[PDB]
Design a protein around this ligand. Structure first.
Ligand code: HEM
Ligand code: HEM
Lengths: 153, 153
């Protein structure tokens, strides 16, 4: 993930892109296509364009550049939003309840144990592997939030 | 992240937990407390409880068990939803447009180049490092979606 400061930098820069999204979009695609002409082959609508001046004059290329950067902006904003979801829970557990990361592991093991006990026939190896991994990813996320709160070691 | 199949298994098992959330919650906490008595110290409301019969009768313990599993269920659902966000984009780019991951690298570089060019002084080393990381994480997510689609190149 990104740190809180890193996310701020990402969102700040993207506000500048959004102030001229069309121009950014155009320049990005032109830069892509001139540095890596093989990428232009993938765009049926304008793979015939041969020069930068031809690319600049293409209204469709400009439209597509906007579509691409708009979609990416959304993706980045959603990533940032998702990474912020556990902030309040990590805050309360780190500083109010005072819970080591290790205790999150203990409760994860307990969850797995209970599921196995209560669901004979319905919590097979694959299902158990999936849940184990989901809970591990959760713990890692909380650990990264702890780090943003000044707990590392 | 988890595979689509792994997410299905996780969400399927959780539906069973939600069919008896209170009972699951209670058993999880009792398991946690009996395997790891030190964890019980963290709960001021019932850290005095000593026997299984006591923990099983405790209203407060059953209540907190439900709070914990309800919150975890929401977290897991949001994670699953987030991991599914890029599915349509990966689908079109893998099988319709046929775009190698390497080409996502090229467009990432092009983005960074354009940002640097258009915002001298407003895209310093740290900001550039942050954006580089964000784009790398995006690429890695698309790569994981490509893998779920059987798509190598
Ligand atoms: C930041 C990376 C990218 C984003 C966010 C992105 C996003 C999009 C979006 C939203 C569309 C419109 C809907 C769709 O057909 O899936 C699209 C179309 C397309 N993308 Fe991308 N894309 C990216 C990278 C690439 C790269 C690197 C290539 C090729 C080298 C590529 C080739 C295409 C093509 C050929 C289309 C169809 C465009 C049309 O025919 O009008 N994309 N892309
Ligand atoms: C899957 C892991 C966990 C989840 C989802 C979770 C969630 C919650 C939630 C939602 C609350 C209520 C709101 C809040 O205070 O932040 C809470 C409170 C609490 N959590 Fe957790 N927690 C987890 C793990 C743990 C563990 C492992 C411990 C201790 C060993 C712990 C100790 C506490 C305590 C002491 C409270 C305060 C309870 C009260 O007021 O009675 N938590 N937790």
């Amino acid at each position: 993930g990104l740190s809180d400061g890193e996310w701020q930098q990402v969102l700040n820069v993207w506000g500048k892109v959004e102030a001229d999204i069309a121009g950014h979009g155009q320049e990005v695609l032109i830069r892509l296509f001139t540095g890596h002409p093989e990428t232009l082959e993938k765009f049926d609508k304008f793979k015939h364009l041969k020069t930068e001046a031809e690319m600049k004059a293409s209204e469709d290329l400009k439209k597509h550049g906007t579509v691409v950067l708009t979609a990416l902006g959304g993706i980045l904003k959603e990533d940032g939003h998702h990474e912020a979801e556990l902030k309040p829970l990590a805050q309360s557990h780190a500083t109010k309840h005072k819970i080591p990361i290790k205790y999150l592991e203990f409760i994860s093991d307990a969850i797995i144990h209970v599921l196995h006990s209560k669901h004979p026939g319905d919590f097979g190896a694959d299902a158990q592997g999936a849940m184990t991994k989901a809970l591990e990813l959760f713990r890692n996320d909380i650990a990264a939030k702890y780090k943003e709160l000044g707990f590392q070691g």
